[PDB]
Design a protein around this nucleic acid. Structure first.
Lengths: 262, 67, 65, 65, 66, 67, 66, 262, 262, 67, 66, 65, 67, 67, 65
RNA sequence: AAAAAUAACAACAAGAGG
RNA sequence: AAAAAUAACAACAAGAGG
C-alpha cells in the first residue's frame, strides 16, 4: 500500500563511492528518492552515462570549486520543479542545496561546509547556519510540507555521541552551536524522522578514518531528515545501517507513510 | 519594447537560471527557451508558458550584461 | 509570435494541461479551441477561461514546439 | 474575438445557468441576459452588470454545443 | 453596447447603485457622471471610481434597458 | 475623455487634501500636484509617482465640483 | 509620456535610492538605471527587470525636483 | 420587537403535500422563509400557479431525475442572491441544496439521502456526509451567518429516538452517523436550534407508516436547523407540531430574534 | 432598545491614575461593567473609599507582591459569582484575571505581562500566552458567553501599528506574538469587538510616554475585547477615545445590544 | 472525626479563599463562613450552602498550619 | 444539624424564592414549603420531593441571615 | 422521614401519573404502587423496584395536595 | 426493608431473567439468585456480585406478584 | 449480611484474577490480595486499595461458586 | 480493618500517592494525616479530600503492611 | 458558578480538576 | 453574492475555485 522511501547518503565523492559499489546498492534498496550530499563533481561529469541509475531521474547542483561541495537527487518521476540553491553566495558559489518540488511535499538535499580545515571554516559553518535560520524564518509560513535531507555535521543532544567529554571542542559538538540548534529546531517546531521511532541513541552516521576509532567506537550522528511538523506524526520507518556503509558516513533510510505524486 | 527584448535575449543565449516573480508573488525558477511580445517560456522539468501580464519581475541569479 | 502556434500544437494532440490562474487556482483539462482573447477548456464541461486571468499554462507530457 | 460571442450567445439563448468565477474567488451565478465588447450582465434575482476584465472563467451548468 | 446606455439609464433615473470593486470592497452611491474611463459618483463626497477596478455595478431598484 | 482631467486639475489648482485608494485597498494621503494621462504625483513627505493603473478610487476629504 | 519620462530620468541621473512598490504590496529598494515604455531596470545586489504594470507607486528617499 | 419565523417541513413530494393541505397551512403560519425538502417535482412543475403562496417569492432547485431530490424555498423578502449546489457531485446533480443570501444572514435548505432505501444509499449518504463536513470546514473562515434547514435523516442522541437500544443497527442511528453529528455540533461549533430553547424528550420529526409506530409515538428526530455560532443566542422558540402534518415528517417551526433584511 | 456599555481602560497603577481624575470620568460615562487592568494595589487599598464609585460594586484581585499586576472590576448590578485566577501559575499569582459570572454572559478582566522590560519578562509573557491558549481550549465545551476585556500587549495586524516595518522586532509585534492572536481570533473563533464594527485605521490604544510619539500619533494597539462567537453580532459601538487618557493607554468603550441580568 | 473540624475552622477564622471542588468538577470559589456536621456556607457574593456529600475536595489559595 | 435547619427555616417562613442545584447540575428554582431530615418539598407549579442526598447547593435570590 | 410518608401515600392512593427523576438525569414516569424505606416500586406495563438512593426528585404531573 | 426482600425473593423463585440498571446507566442482564442486605448475586455466563449502592432500578421481564 | 463475605473469601482463597468495576464505569483487573469491611485491595503490579462505596460490580474471570 | 494500618504505613514512610476520585480525576502528593471522613494531602498546598469521593489509592512504589 | 432533568453505553488502569 | 477600503509581507512552483 503506502510507501514513500527516501534515503540520504553522504558519499563524500561520487568518484570515491563509484569504486565500492554504491549504485548496485541504490538499485536494490527500492527507494523513491535518493538524496546525495558531497557529490564532489561537475555537471558534465554526471552527463557521462555510466552514472545514472536504472529507471530513475538524476538532478544535481555543482560547486564552482568542484571537490568542495555539490549535491544531487534521484527521483523516480520527474518533479514539477527543480530549484537550485537558496539565493545567497555561501550556498550558490559552492552549491549546497537542491530542491525537487512535487505536489504537497518537496524533497530538498541540504549540505553544510565542514569546519574541519581550520577555524575559518567553522566560522563559515556558523555563517551558513545563521543565514539558514533566517531562511526558515521566511519558510515558516508556507504550506508545502517540507522534508530536508540534510548533512548538518552537528549532533543534537548527549546520546548522539560517545565520549563527548573530549568531543566538546571538536567540530560537531559545540555548545553554542548545540544550544542554538536547540533554539532553532525547538520553537520553529521542525522535527527529525529518527526520533519518532527511537528515543535512545547508539545509532550513528560518521566515523574518522582509523580502525583505532572502529574497535573503540566513538560516534557522531549527523545526517538528518528535517521534518516540518505536519509530517511529525507521519514517519513510517527509519533505519541507520553501519555495516554496508559507503564512505566515512552511513546511509539513512526513511519510509514515510504517504504517496509521493505530481 | 526598446529595452526589454535585448535583456531577454542576453538572458536567452547564456543559460542563465533566471527566476520570474508573478504579480501574486509566486516564484518560478528556470531558463528561458523563447519568448514573444506577450509570453515568456520557462525551461525546467516540464516546459511552461507564462504570460507577461501576470509577471511581476524578472531576476537573474547570475550578474549578467546590461543592454 | 510564439503564443498561438504553441496553443495550436497543444490543442491538436490533446494534451492534459493544468492552467494556473493569477490568484493561484489550478484548472485541469484539454484545450478544445482558442482565439485571440479566451481559451475554451474542457474536461467535464466547456468553460471559457479568460486569458487575463491565466498566469501559466502547464502541459503534463512535454510537447515539441 | 471569434470564439467569445457564439459561446455567450449560446449561453444566453437557452437560458443556461452559468457560474462566473471572478478574479478574487467570488462565484457569481445566474443567467446571461446580454453582453457586449466590455460588459456582460447576469441575473440571479436582480440584474447586474459584470465587467469582463474581472471574470476569471465562465462555467455552465449543463454541457452545450 | 449596453455599457453606456445602462450607465446613462442609472444616471437619469438617479438610482442608488452599489459598486463592487476588484477586491471585495463595495461603494454605494449615485452615479453623477461618467466617461469611457472613469465614473464620478456621490454619496458623501464626490468620488472618481476608475473602471479598471470595478468588478460589478448592481442597482438597488430593478432597472429597464431601452 | 472629458471627465477626469477637470477632476484631477481641479484638485491640483485648489490644493485639496486627497486620499488615493489603490486596487489592493491601500490608502495614500496627500495632495495632487501633477498628472498626465498615465500617472499621478502626490506629496506629504516625498513626492511619489503613483501609477494610474493601480488606483482604484480618488476620494477628496473636502467636496469639490468641476467647472 | 509627458510626466513619468522626466521623473524617471531625473532619478536615473542623480542615482537616488528609490523604493519601488509592487501592486501586491511588496517593497523593492534599488536604483533606477534604465527604463523604456514598458520595463524598469532596478539595480541592487542583483540587477532585475520590473514591469510597469506590476508597479503601484515609485517613491524616492530624498526629495527630487523635475 | 424584531422577530423571524422559519419552517423546514420535509414534504415527500410537494404535490402530495399540496393535495393533503400544505399551502393552505403555510399561508396561515406567518413565516419569513419557508424551506421544503424532497419537493420531487421539476422546476417547470413549480412555476405552475398552483404552488405560489401569496406574497412569497418562490425559488426552487430540482433534481436531474425529478423524483429523487428537488428542494424549494419560499421567501417573503426577495434575497440578494439565490444560489444552488454545494460543489460536490452528490448535491449538484441530485438537487439537494439551495441558499438564499440576505443582508447579514443567509438561509439555506438541505436534503440528505436517507440510507433506508438500500446499502448503496448508505454509501451515498456516507459520501455526502463526508464532503459536507469538508464544506462546513470551508465555511468556517467566512463572515456570514447560516441557518441550514436540513432534513439530515440522522438522529443525533438517545433522546432523539424512542427505544434507542433497538435502533443501533438501523440507519439513522449508526455510529458513524452519530459521530458525524457529534463532530458538526460538538467540535465544529455549529449550534442546533431545537436544543437551545427546549431539551425535553419526546420531540420527533419522522414516523414510519405503521399505525402501531404512530400511536406509541415511535419517532425519530431528523429535521434540524443547524446554525452558525453567531446565531445561537437569537433563538426564542423551536417547536415540532406533531399533529397537523402533511407527509411522514413533521414541520419544524423556529422563531428567531433576528430582523431579516434585504 | 437594549444596551450595555463596557469600558476597559488600563490605568498603570490605579493610585497614579486616581490622582489624574480617573474615577470622576468613569462615573460620567454611564457604564455597566468597568474593567481595570494593572491596578498595582493591594486588597485593602481598594477598600478605602477613594475608589468606591457610587452605584457600583468593586471587586479586585491583588498580587502577592502588589507592584506587578492587580486587576479590578466595577459593576452596575451584582454578579452571580466572582472568581479569580485561570488555574495556572503565571495568571493567578500576579493578579491577572478576574471573572464576573452573570446570567448568560460573564465578563472577565485579563492582564498579560508586557514583555518590554527584558527576557525575564518576555519568556514569562510567552508562557502566559500558551497556557492561556490551553485554558481557552477548555472553554470550547461550556455554555457561557465571555467578554475578556484584555490588555494583551500584542498588536494583531499591520493596521494596529504605525510604521510596522520598524516594529517587527520590538516586543509587542513579534511573529510568535502575532501568531498567538492569529490563533485566538482565527482558529479558536473568537472575535475582536473593535474589528466587528469599525475597520478604520489609526485606532490606537497605547502610546510611549514621549511627546513626539504622542502628537505624531505613532502608537500601538494593545487593548482588546475578546468575544465568544455567540456575541459577534451584538456589538454596536466600539470606540477608542484618544484625548482623555489617564495613563499611557486609552479607554476602550464598547456598546452592546445586550441586557445584563443576574 | 478529628482532622475535620480543625481544618475548616482555621480556614473560617483567617478568611482564606477556598476553591471547593464538588463531585462533578464544579469549582465553587469563595470563603468559608460557617459549617455544621453536614453543610458548609461559602460567601463569594451571595451566601450559599454546600452539602458535604456533594464535596470532593477543598483547596485553599494559601497554606494553613494545623497543631 | 445546628446550622442545617435555621437556614432553611429562614428560607421557609419568609417565602423568599430559592434555587436548588442538584448533584448532576440541575437547578430547581421556586419556594420551600417544608422539610425533613431527609426531604425538602419544593414549591412551583407543582410540589416536588427533593431528596437531600441529591441536592448540592442552595442559592437564595435575596440574602438571609439566622 | 416525618413528611415523606404522607406525600408518597397521597401520591399512591390517588393514583396520579408521577415522574421520578433519577440522579443521573433519567426520568421514569408511571404510577407508585407502594412506598417503603430504601425502595419505591414504580408500576407500569412492568413493575420495577427503584431504589431511593438513586432518586433526585419525585414529581406529580398534576397538582396534588 | 418491608418489601425488597419479598420482591427479590419472588423474583428469584420464579427464575425470572431480569435487567439491573446501574446508577451510571449500565444495563446488566442476568438472573438474580441470591441477595443480601448489601449485595445481589447475578447469574449469567459468570456469577457477579453487584452492590446495592450502585443500582438505580431492578427491572423484570414479565409481571410478578406479591404474597 | 451473610452472603457477601463468604463469596468474597471464596474468591480470596483460590486467588482468582478478578475485574473490579467502578461506578464511573471503568474496569480494574487484578488479583485480590486482602480485604475487610470497607475496602477491597487489588494486587496488580502495584498494591492498591479500592473503596467499596465506589466499586460498581465484582466479576470473576472463571465460574467458581460459594460453599 | 485494613484502611487504617495501610494509610498509616503509607504516611510514615513518606510514600508519594496518586489518588483517583469518583469523577475520574487524579490527585498527587504525600498523605499528611487521615480521619474517619477525610484525608489531608500535601503538595503545592495543604489539601483536604473526602473519603466519599476517593475511588482508589495508587502508590508510587510498592508498599507493604 | 452548575442544561426544569438522555425509560437508561455487558461497563473509557481513571481528563492536578467537567 | 463580495470588509466605505491593511502609507504597502526583496516576494506562499500556485488552495477545481478566497
Amino acid at each position: 500500500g503506502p510507501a514513500m522511501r527516501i534515503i540520504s547518503v553522504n558519499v563524500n565523492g561520487i568518484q570515491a563511492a563509484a569504486e565500492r559499489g554504491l549504485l548496485s546498492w541504490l538499485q536494490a534498496q527500492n527507494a523513491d528518492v535518493i538524496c546525495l550530499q558531497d557529490t564532489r563533481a561537475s555537471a558534465f561529469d554526471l552527463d557521462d552515462p555510466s552514472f545514472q541509475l536504472d529507471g530513475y531521474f538524476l538532478y544535481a547542483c555543482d560547486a564552482e570549486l568542484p571537490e568542495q561541495g555539490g549535491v544531487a537527487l534521484y527521483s523516480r518521476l520527474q518533479p514539477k520543479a527543480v530549484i537550485s540553491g537558496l539565493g545567497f553566495e555561501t550556498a550558490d558559489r559552492y552549491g549546497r542545496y537542491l530542491q525537487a518540488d512535487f505536489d504537497k511535499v518537496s524533497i530538498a538535499t541540504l549540505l553544510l561546509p565542514s569546519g574541519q580545515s581550520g577555524d575559518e571554516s567553522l566560522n563559515q559553518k556558523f555563517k551558513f547556519m545563521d543565514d539558514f535560520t533566517h531562511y526558515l524564518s521566511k519558510q515558516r509560513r508556507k504550506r508545502r510540507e517540507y522534508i530536508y535531507c540534510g548533512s548538518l555535521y552537528v549532533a543534537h543532544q548527549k546520546m548522539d555521541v560517545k565520549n563527548w567529554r573530549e568531543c566538546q571542542q571538536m567540530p560537531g559538538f559545540l555548545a553554542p552551536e548545540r544550544a542554538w540548534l536547540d533554539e532553532v529546531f525547538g520553537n520553529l517546531g521542525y522535527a527529525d524522522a529518527l526520533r519518532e521511532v527511537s528515543r535512545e541513541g547508539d545509532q550513528f552516521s560518521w566515523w574518522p578514518d582509523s580502525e583505532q576509532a572502529e574497535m573503540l567506537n566513538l560516534g557522531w550522528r549527523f545526517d538528518y531528515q528535517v521534518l516540518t511538523p505536519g509530517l511529525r506524526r507521519f514517519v513510517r520507518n527509519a533505519k541507520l545501517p553501519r555495516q554496508p556503509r559507503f564512505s566515512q558516513h552511513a546511509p539513512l533510510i526513511v519510509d514515510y507513510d504517504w504517496q509521493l505524486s505530481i | 519594447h526598446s529595452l526589454q527584448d535585448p535583456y531577454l535575449n542576453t538572458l536567452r543565449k547564456e543559460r542563465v537560471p533566471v527566476s520570474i516573480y508573478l504579480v501574486n508573488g509566486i516564484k518560478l525558477q528556470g531558463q528561458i527557451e523563447s519568448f514573444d511580445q506577450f509570453v515568456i517560456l520557462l525551461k525546467n522539468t516540464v516546459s511552461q508558458m507564462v504570460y507577461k501580464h501576470a509577471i511581476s519581475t524578472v531576476v537573474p541569479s547570475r550578474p549578467v550584461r546590461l543592454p
